[PDB]
Amino acid sequence: SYTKEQLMLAFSYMSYYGITHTKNAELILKKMKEALKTWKPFQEDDWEVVWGPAVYTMPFTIFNDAMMYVIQKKGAEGEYVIAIRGTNPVSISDWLFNDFMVSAMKKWPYASVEGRILKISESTSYGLKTLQKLKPKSHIPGENKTILQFLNEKIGPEGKAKICVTGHSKGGALSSTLALWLKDIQGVKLSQNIDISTIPFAGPTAGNADFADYFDDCLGDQCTRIANSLDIVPYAWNTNSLKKLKSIYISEQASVKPLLYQRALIRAMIAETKGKKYKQIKAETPPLEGNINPILIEYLVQAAYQHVVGYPELMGMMDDIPLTDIFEDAIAGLL
């Protein structure tokens, strides 16, 4: 009844439990277990959190918050889901528009291509490194092991398995990027007998055209990039895409325009990523055609709705994913 994409949307959203909870992977873990037991999409199988949640959070800052966990389907031998979360996604203008770290880039360290220069933003580079070093704490499944150590120990150096890496928002950019890293080290530091796929939602561009083209050639069909046409997030940071942000919500049915402060940020983003050749992975993939919510006349509010509410809505999951329970007051008046 639920498609693979709908299932991964559920895991991507369950990642958000405790997004506004001001060090407690314990609180999140408890939440995940209850969900895997009550959420409709999780009732057709028996899932088990086998690694994480591993959380990255420091007091007095949230913009770089992150979380990753691994769910294993009971019974099914070698069937795992790696889900990734970044910061509270509703405040797009703050964590996305004000990202200084996309003006500088690092060459992809896990593969090279003749006559190509693969590069990722330092922004995603630091995001990936934090995920590669995360370790669940005491009493948390996967205690004291990095994701790589856990997989190698769980699957064995030559074991056969299936792994889908998913995530929403920053998690969309990170999951797809993490999946490629796992792909690139297979046969060296990871069993070559594992089938790696990824379904990243609403993610901005992790790197440049050459990086994105290499990614496409590597995952091909094993990557399903899901983006809402009216969600502004995926529109960064390809230059052409950025130039569509000012009038993304201007139709013949409604007209929601960005305040001047945001117009200045958009122009700054274009200016700072000019010449970087930022490009979406699976860039030709058709998006889910979104619909402007007429009640939300403020650009930032409309943007938060399309980014967070948009996906479960356009994918028929509204009655399946408990938004208010996950985001609480983060969804203030969006709904």
Nearest to 7 by CA among 56, 61, 44: 44
Residue 173: give its domain's CATH number.
Answer: 3.40.50.1820
Maximum Cα–Cα distance for the chain, whole Å?
Answer: 58
Give the strand pairing for 105-107 and 161-168: unpaired
Q: How far is CA 56 from CA 45, 48, 130, in A?
A: 29, 22, 8
Contact 107, 90 (CB under 8 A): no
What range defines the domain where residue 83 resides?
1-335
Is 182 buried (19+), middle (13-18) or exposed (0-12) by CB count in 10 A? Answer: buried
Elucidation technique: X-ray
Main-chain phi, psi angles of 146, to 5 degrees: -75, 170
Could you give the strand order of the β-sheet that contains 47-58, starting from the edge strand earlier in sequence?
47-58, 61-73, 79-85, 161-168, 194-201
- List, in order, residues 6 or more apart from 277 with CB less than 8 Å away: 208, 209, 210
| Domain count along the chain | 1
| Under 8 Å between Cβ of 106 and 178 | no
Resolution given for this structure, in angstroms? 2.2
* Phi and psi, residue 50, nearest 5°: -110, -5
- Residues 108 and 224: their CA atoms lie apart, in Å, by 21
* Alpha carbons 103 and 121: distance in angstroms, whole number: 7
**Given the structure tokens 């004291």, which residue do they identify?**
144
Of 102, 80, 43, nearest to 160 by C-alpha is 80
Strand residues in the chain grouped as ranges (E): 47-58, 61-73, 79-85, 105-107, 119-121, 161-168, 194-201
Tokens 């490629």 sit at which residue? 180
Of 216, 52, 227, which is closest to residue 147 (Cα–Cα)? Answer: 52
